């Protein structure tokens, strides 16, 4: 039964560094895109980053090319979001997403950018 | 019998196929695993060179008998798992009724800790606008009855049975399997007793894919003839 934890989140100062982190269980890594989102309080959820089933593409969203690198460890099964300069814009929930049949999220992972 | 040992788990399967048929070339890749210990393949083939001139079904027999489950009280008669890790050499003509025929030569191997099978195939005789040429079988497999028997001579097994395609008319066409194998290696292998196995296959597509493909899940199981009142 297919599942996604995130994990990683904290608070970090302007220009910081942070790398989240998304286990998952019930299905192969290596097999479906994977993706990330973020939600900034009372603001739509808003797509990050992915990768493909394959893994050989990777696609970012404008404000965050060239900061964030998504990638992942298909033995095991885990996601991952590097995340380097960090605005205070980037404070947010970032959950991890699938679709396995149906679309699956996990329960996200607070990333707060202040000093 | 030392082979056998190498079946315990689950095994990952890589299946290689070139195929020319009536002159049109086409290759398959697939992958997937194999758990002999419940006799069941899950598998995804992939045809690499675009589009399959012929229709899926017709590859299935030909894409690891090794996989099959043998009950104990049988566990003597796998030839297929005891001439490993070396593997055998599978050889087919298959007979489509009214149509043409497919001739392959296999190689069931480890290469490392996978299972592989490398085959090429070679059809002539074909109708171009025949039930296979013309795209015209069904998407889904059949359950049959694959007889063994020893071949002391060759130093292996051989095998016969019909496989039944559900063609869309409603109709059903027979293709005559006649199969043929041979240890690679000098090992000692078991020659087994007359026998058959058990088939049930279900295909599938994955819905995510946009090439030409086709999802196998398939269960095998050893059986055995029981004599009648005639002995």
């Known amino acids: 039964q297919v599942q996604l934890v995130e994990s990683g989140g904290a608070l970090v100062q302007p220009g910081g560094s942070l790398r989240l982190s998304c286990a998952a269980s019930?299905?192969?890594?290596?097999?479906?895109?994977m993706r990330w989102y973020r939600q900034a309080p009372g603001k739509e959820r808003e797509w990050v980053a992915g990768?493909?089933?394959?893994?050989?593409?990777?696609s970012y969203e404008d404000s965050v090319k060239g900061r964030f690198t998504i990638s992942r460890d298909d033995a095991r099964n885990t996601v991952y979001l590097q995340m380097n300069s960090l605005k205070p814009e980037d404070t947010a929930v970032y959950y991890c997403?699938?679709?396995?049949?149906?679309?699956?999220w996990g329960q996200g992972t607070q990333v707060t950018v202040s000093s | 019998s030392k082979g056998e040992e190498l079946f315990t788990g689950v095994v990952p399967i890589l299946v290689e196929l070139d195929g020319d048929v009536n002159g049109h070339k086409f290759s398959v890749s697939g992958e997937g695993e194999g758990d002999a210990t419940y006799g069941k393949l899950t598998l995804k083939f992939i045809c690499t060179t675009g589009k399959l001139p012929v229709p899926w079904p017709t590859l299935v027999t030909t894409l690891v008998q090794c996989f099959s489950r043998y009950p104990d009280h049988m566990k003597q008669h796998d030839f297929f798992k005891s001439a490993m890790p070396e593997g055998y050499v599978q050889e087919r003509t298959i007979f489509f009724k009214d149509d043409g025929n497919y001739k392959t030569r296999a190689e069931v191997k480890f290469e490392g800790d996978t299972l592989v099978n490398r085959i090429e195939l070679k059809g002539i005789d074909f109708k171009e606008d025949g039930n296979i040429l013309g795209h015209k079988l069904e998407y889904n497999y059949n359950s049959h009855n694959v007889y063994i028997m020893a071949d002391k001579q060759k130093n292996g097994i051989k095998v016969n049975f019909k496989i039944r395609h559900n063609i869309e008319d409603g109709s059903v066409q027979l293709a005559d399997h006649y199969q043929q194998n041979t240890p690679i290696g000098d090992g000692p292998v078991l020659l087994p007793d007359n026998h058959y196995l058990s088939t049930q296959s279900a295909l599938s597509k994955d819905p995510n894919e946009k090439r030409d493909h086709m999802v196998l899940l398939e269960f095998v199981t050893a059986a055995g003839i029981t004599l009648g009142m005639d002995e």
């Open positions: 990768m493909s089933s394959a893994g050989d593409r990777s």
């Open positions: 019930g299905f192969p890594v290596n097999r479906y895109s």
């Open positions: 997403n699938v679709n396995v049949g149906f679309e699956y």
